Amino acid sequence: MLKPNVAIIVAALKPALGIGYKGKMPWRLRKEIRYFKDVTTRTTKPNTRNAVIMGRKTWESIPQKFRPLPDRLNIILSRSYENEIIDDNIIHASSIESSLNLVSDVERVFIIGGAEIYNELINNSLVSHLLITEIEHPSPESIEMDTFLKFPLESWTKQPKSELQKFVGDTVLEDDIKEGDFTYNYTLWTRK
Ligand SMILES: NC(=O)C1=CN([C@@H]2O[C@H](COP(=O)(O)OP(=O)(O)OC[C@H]3O[C@@H](n4cnc5c(N)ncnc54)[C@H](OP(=O)(O)O)[C@@H]3O)[C@@H](O)[C@H]2O)C=CC1
Numbered sequence: 150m151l152k153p154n155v156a157i158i159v160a161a162l163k164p165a166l167g168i169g170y171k172g173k174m175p176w177r178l179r180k181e182i183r184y185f186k187d188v189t190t191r192t193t194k195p196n197t198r199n200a201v202i203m204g205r206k207t208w209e210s211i212p213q214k215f216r217p218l219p220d221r222l223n224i225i226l227s228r229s230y231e232n233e234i235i236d237d238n239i240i241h242a243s244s245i246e247s248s249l250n251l252v253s254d255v256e257r258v259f260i261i262g263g264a265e266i267y268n269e270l271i272n273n274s275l276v277s278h279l280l281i282t283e284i285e286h287p288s289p290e291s292i293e294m295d296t297f298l299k300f301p302l303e304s305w306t307k308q309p310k311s312e313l314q315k316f317v318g319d320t321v322l323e324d325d326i327k328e329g330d331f332t333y334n335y336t337l338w339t340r341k
């Protein structure tokens with residue numbers, strides 16, 4: 150796969166864009182999790198799949214029984230990994246481009262975490278889309294948070310809902326979804 154168009158997918162708490170605390174997620178938003186599954190899994194052309202790419206720490210955060218994430222090609226990046234195809238669902242590499250050089254029959258490519266990987270790849274020109282779940286809370290400062298996005302969104306344009314709807318197909322997009330004290334919306338951004 151040569152020069153794939155790549156999408157970042159992430160859920161972040163406004164306005165600071167916090168995404169984690171002590172190696173874990175600061176919320177459990179069940180509908181958001183299902184959205185993540187549906188969007189990363191679904192394909193538009195028959196007999197293909199998507200790839201999901203992540204840093205080693207993010208991979209290790211998934212319970213070992215629930216990785217690899219089913220129905221998607223999982224790619225894990227470490228600075229200690231040489232290129233290795235582990236099995237049909239798992240690749241080890243040290244860059245996204247090299248990891249996908251090894252790959253055919255993949256439609257979409259998603260970056261699924263974590264902060265370090267996000268904050269590098271936001272400035273990689275292969276990344277053409279951001280799928281950001283913007284989470285809001287009445288008192289965001291009260292949520293324990295130590296990992297943050299550093300996204301220069303001035304160089305990006307938030308697209309209308311119609312563009313997001315097109316991207317996700319017939320996936321149902323509900324507005325202002327509320328779980329506990331959190332309220333969230335699905336968004337799509339492209340390069341300005
Ligand atoms: N809210 C959300 O939507 C999401 C939040 N998260 C959160 O993010 C946090 C994890 O993020 P973070 O701790 O930054 O870790 P990452 O998941 O981003 O992994 C970092 C590791 O990836 C490898 N790596 C980083 N850059 C490169 C590179 N350029 N080339 C090759 N390998 C590289 C290194 O592995 P090595 O050390 O082996 O060399 C590094 O230690 C957790 O708290 C998690 O819950 C994660 C996903 C989504």
Ligand SMILES: COc1cc(C(C)(C)C#Cc2c(C)nc(N)nc2N)cc(OC)c1OC
Pocket residue numbers: 158159160174181182185207210211212215218260261262282
């Ligand atoms: C697939 O579910 C998980 C996803 C994840 C990761 C970190 C890969 C994620 C994510 C993610 C979500 C939930 N939403 C959005 N919008 N983007 C993401 N990258 C970690 C998990 O355990 C900690 C999970 O439970 C098994």
